[PDB]
Amino acid sequence: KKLPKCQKQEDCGSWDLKCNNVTCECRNQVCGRGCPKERYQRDKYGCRKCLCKGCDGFKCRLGCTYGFKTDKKGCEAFCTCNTKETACVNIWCTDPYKCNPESGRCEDPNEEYEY
Amino acid sequence: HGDPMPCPKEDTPNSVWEPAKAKYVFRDVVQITCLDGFEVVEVGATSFYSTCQSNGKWSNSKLKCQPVDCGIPESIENGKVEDPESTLFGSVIRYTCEEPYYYMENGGGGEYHCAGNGSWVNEVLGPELPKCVPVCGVPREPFEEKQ
Amino acid sequence: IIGGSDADIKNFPWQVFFDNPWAGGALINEYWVLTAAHVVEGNREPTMYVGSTSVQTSRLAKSKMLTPEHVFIHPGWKLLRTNFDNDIALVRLKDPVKMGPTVSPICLPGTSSDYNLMDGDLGLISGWGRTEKRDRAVRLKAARLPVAPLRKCKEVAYVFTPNMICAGGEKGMDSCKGDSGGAFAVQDPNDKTKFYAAGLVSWGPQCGTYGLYTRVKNYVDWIMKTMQENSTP
Ligand SMILES: *[C@@H]1O[C@H](CO)[C@@H](O[C@@H]2O[C@H](CO)[C@@H](O)[C@H](O)[C@H]2NC(C)=O)[C@H](O)[C@H]1NC(C)=O
């Protein structure tokens, strides 16, 4: 499908998208744990989702300290947390994002948060 | 030989003597009954006996009918009661909850007086004290959505 | 909360912050917190904070912390291929919470038909869970959601029961990971100045559309019975 014109974010109809001056546009946000190889899903517009192929993405809405336990496909378990040991097991971070062993999440160390 | 020495009546604004005789005499016994709100303390009662003694004086001259004392009001959780000038019979206290975060669950109005029987009582709750419990479901400020 | 807005803790003074794992709860009186079963399942002595808009580590150390005494998981939780029915639990506190401008309880639903959620009802969700920007929110977020037909939660294997409320769909607003256990606060139809906990953030598809909430109305009797049976002497 073709991209829709966007007045605001609400018009794009998906969080995989982001609006601009040339009013919508494919958002390719950094994925928390990412997907292996080229195993990402894509929507009607072909924008990269933060969900791996074969995964439905259904889960409890619990904030896992070391991230959700993910398989070799990149599928996050429905409601199983990583231990401190599997925090960086099955994760796909690209520079400058590296897996943070304390959160089980792809992070850039140089990145500075506003708070 | 002669005459049994008579004991005089009393100023009894706080009690009632029974039996009520014009002339009391050696070994006569009165039952002295305090009026409502008054008691005798020996630890208190509402009546006592007095005997006309051979010296023309009443026994138990050490027992008087005095106002009943409900004592210092007991405090409640999550509430306040201001300390009254007196805690004697007829004295009035007011309980109020910590508003607006608490309210009086059992109602009653929080107003208590010192009853004849010695308890702080409320017209609705009797001697049962107010219960101050949390107000639920009220945000301190309304959530305002981003326009 | 995705698609939401900044909220002050004063807007949701019943909101409880669970840490490790990252989650939410709802204070329902001075000795009890309501949350989802899956939040305290292997977390029977949960770390809980109240009274603060922010959950920055710096600020947590200055916040009111709640001391758990006992966690009561609902008997039907994981009793009977994924099935999240009866996703509800009660945390009894050791000490009574002092209420104030930043800390106060939310109401429970009544038992009458007036508290049967259906089309037309609206709720507020609140929490420090994932947003559009980050996987966790430092400052409290919130959003208003409509109740939605259950049919719309099950699209694009899982058990959907009448103990679950479907909500969302409008403007991408939804709850996400980190929001579990938080209350779906709904206006009380009989006392419109009050909110009550009609739902608890439970589970759903990848956030941004719809989600499922534990329908609290069906547990009121169990909640009442548990609180009475574990009184405060
Ligand atoms: C002292 O007198 C008061 C009179 O009010 C008694 O209050 C009553 O208490 C009983 C229960 O204890 C209630 O059933 C009545 O309704 C109350 N009277 C009211 C509300 O007017 C109080 O009990 C007495 N104190 C005692 C007997 O120790």
Coordinates of N, CA and C in Angstrom, one line a residue, chain A residues 10 13 15-16 27 29-33 49-51 56-68 76 78-79 81 103 105 113-115, chain C residues 2-3 20-23 38-39 56 82 84 132 134-136 138 155 158 172 174-180 201-206 208 210-211:
Chain A
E10 N -1.5 10.9 14.7 CA -2.7 10.2 14.7 C -3.2 9.8 13.3
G13 N -1.8 6.4 11.6 CA -2.5 5.2 12.0 C -1.6 4.0 12.5
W15 N 2.3 3.2 14.9 CA 3.4 3.7 15.6 C 4.7 3.4 14.9
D16 N 4.6 2.6 13.8 CA 5.8 2.3 13.0 C 6.0 3.4 12.0
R27 N 8.8 5.0 10.1 CA 9.7 5.1 11.3 C 10.5 3.8 11.4
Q29 N 12.5 2.9 14.1 CA 13.0 3.1 15.5 C 13.9 1.9 15.9
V30 N 14.9 2.2 16.8 CA 15.7 1.1 17.3 C 14.9 0.1 18.1
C31 N 15.0 -1.2 17.7 CA 14.2 -2.2 18.4 C 14.9 -2.6 19.7
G32 N 14.1 -2.8 20.8 CA 14.6 -3.2 22.1 C 15.6 -4.3 22.1
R33 N 15.2 -5.4 21.4 CA 16.0 -6.6 21.4 C 16.3 -7.0 19.9
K49 N 8.7 -3.3 11.3 CA 8.2 -3.4 12.6 C 9.2 -3.8 13.6
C50 N 9.0 -3.7 14.9 CA 9.8 -4.2 15.9 C 9.3 -5.5 16.4
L51 N 9.1 -6.5 15.4 CA 8.5 -7.8 15.7 C 9.1 -8.7 14.6
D56 N 3.9 -13.5 17.1 CA 2.6 -12.8 17.1 C 2.7 -11.6 18.0
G57 N 3.7 -11.5 18.9 CA 3.9 -10.4 19.7 C 3.0 -10.3 20.9
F58 N 2.1 -11.3 21.1 CA 1.3 -11.3 22.3 C 2.0 -11.5 23.6
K59 N 1.7 -10.7 24.6 CA 2.4 -10.8 25.9 C 1.7 -10.2 27.0
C60 N 2.0 -10.6 28.3 CA 1.7 -9.8 29.4 C 2.4 -8.5 29.4
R61 N 1.9 -7.5 30.0 CA 2.5 -6.1 29.9 C 3.3 -5.8 31.2
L62 N 4.1 -6.8 31.5 CA 5.1 -6.7 32.6 C 6.4 -6.2 32.2
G63 N 7.0 -5.3 33.0 CA 8.3 -4.8 32.6 C 9.4 -5.6 33.2
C64 N 10.0 -6.5 32.4 CA 11.1 -7.4 32.8 C 12.4 -6.6 33.0
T65 N 13.0 -6.8 34.1 CA 14.2 -6.2 34.5 C 15.3 -6.5 33.4
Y66 N 15.4 -7.7 33.0 CA 16.4 -8.1 32.1 C 15.8 -8.4 30.7
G67 N 14.7 -7.8 30.5 CA 14.0 -8.0 29.2 C 13.2 -9.4 29.1
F68 N 12.4 -9.5 28.1 CA 11.7 -10.8 27.9 C 12.6 -11.8 27.4
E76 N 9.6 -13.0 21.6 CA 9.6 -12.8 23.0 C 8.5 -13.7 23.6
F78 N 5.6 -15.1 26.1 CA 4.3 -14.4 26.5 C 4.5 -13.7 27.9
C79 N 5.0 -14.4 28.8 CA 5.2 -13.8 30.1 C 6.3 -14.5 30.9
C81 N 10.4 -13.8 32.0 CA 11.5 -12.8 32.1 C 12.8 -13.5 31.9
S103 N 20.0 -4.6 31.7 CA 18.6 -4.3 31.3 C 18.1 -5.3 30.2
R105 N 18.7 -5.0 27.1 CA 18.1 -4.1 26.0 C 19.2 -3.5 25.2
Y113 N 20.2 10.8 28.4 CA 18.7 10.9 28.5 C 18.5 12.2 29.2
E114 N 17.3 12.8 28.9 CA 17.0 14.2 29.3 C 16.8 14.3 30.8
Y115 N 16.1 13.3 31.4 CA 15.8 13.3 32.8 C 17.0 13.3 33.6
Chain C
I2 N 1.4 4.0 25.8 CA 1.7 4.5 24.5 C 0.6 5.5 24.1
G3 N 1.0 6.6 23.5 CA 0.0 7.6 23.0 C -0.5 8.5 24.1
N20 N 11.2 -4.1 39.8 CA 11.8 -5.4 39.7 C 10.9 -6.6 40.1
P21 N 10.0 -7.0 39.2 CA 9.7 -6.4 37.9 C 9.0 -5.1 37.9
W22 N 9.1 -4.3 36.8 CA 8.6 -3.0 36.6 C 7.1 -3.1 36.3
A23 N 6.3 -2.5 37.2 CA 4.8 -2.7 37.1 C 4.0 -1.7 37.9
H38 N 0.0 -12.0 37.6 CA 1.3 -12.4 37.0 C 2.4 -11.4 37.4
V39 N 2.0 -10.3 38.1 CA 3.0 -9.4 38.6 C 3.6 -9.8 39.9
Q56 N 12.6 8.1 38.8 CA 14.1 8.2 38.8 C 14.7 7.6 40.1
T82 N -2.0 -20.6 26.1 CA -1.9 -19.6 27.1 C -3.2 -19.1 27.6
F84 N -4.8 -16.6 30.6 CA -4.5 -15.6 31.7 C -5.8 -15.2 32.4
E132 N 6.2 5.6 23.2 CA 6.7 5.7 21.8 C 8.2 5.9 21.8
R134 N 10.6 5.5 24.8 CA 11.4 4.6 25.5 C 10.7 3.4 26.0
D135 N 11.5 2.4 26.5 CA 10.9 1.1 27.0 C 10.3 1.3 28.4
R136 N 10.8 2.4 29.1 CA 10.2 2.7 30.4 C 10.1 4.2 30.5
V138 N 10.1 7.6 32.9 CA 10.6 8.1 34.2 C 9.5 8.9 34.9
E155 N -7.6 -10.4 16.9 CA -7.2 -10.5 15.5 C -5.7 -10.6 15.3
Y158 N -5.1 -18.3 22.2 CA -5.2 -17.6 23.4 C -6.7 -17.6 23.9
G172 N -4.4 5.2 18.8 CA -3.2 4.4 19.1 C -2.9 4.4 20.6
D174 N -2.9 3.1 24.3 CA -2.9 1.8 24.8 C -1.9 1.6 26.0
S175 N -2.0 0.6 26.8 CA -1.0 0.3 27.8 C 0.1 -0.7 27.3
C176 N 1.3 -0.6 27.8 CA 2.4 -1.5 27.3 C 3.1 -2.1 28.4
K177 N 4.2 -2.9 28.1 CA 4.9 -3.6 29.2 C 5.5 -2.6 30.2
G178 N 5.3 -2.9 31.4 CA 5.6 -1.9 32.5 C 4.4 -1.3 33.1
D179 N 3.2 -1.5 32.5 CA 2.0 -1.0 33.0 C 1.1 -2.0 33.7
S180 N 1.5 -3.3 33.6 CA 0.7 -4.4 34.2 C 0.3 -4.1 35.7
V201 N -4.6 -3.7 34.1 CA -3.8 -4.0 32.9 C -3.2 -5.4 33.1
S202 N -3.5 -6.2 32.1 CA -3.2 -7.7 32.2 C -2.3 -8.1 31.0
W203 N -2.8 -8.1 29.8 CA -2.1 -8.6 28.6 C -2.8 -8.1 27.3
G204 N -2.2 -8.5 26.2 CA -2.8 -8.2 24.9 C -1.7 -8.4 23.8
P205 N -2.1 -8.0 22.6 CA -1.2 -8.0 21.5 C -0.1 -6.9 21.7
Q206 N 0.9 -6.8 20.8 CA 1.9 -5.8 20.9 C 1.1 -4.4 20.9
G208 N -0.4 -0.6 21.3 CA -0.6 0.4 20.3 C -2.0 0.4 19.7
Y210 N -5.2 -2.5 20.9 CA -6.1 -2.9 22.0 C -5.4 -3.7 23.0
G211 N -6.1 -3.9 24.2 CA -5.5 -4.7 25.3 C -6.6 -5.3 26.1

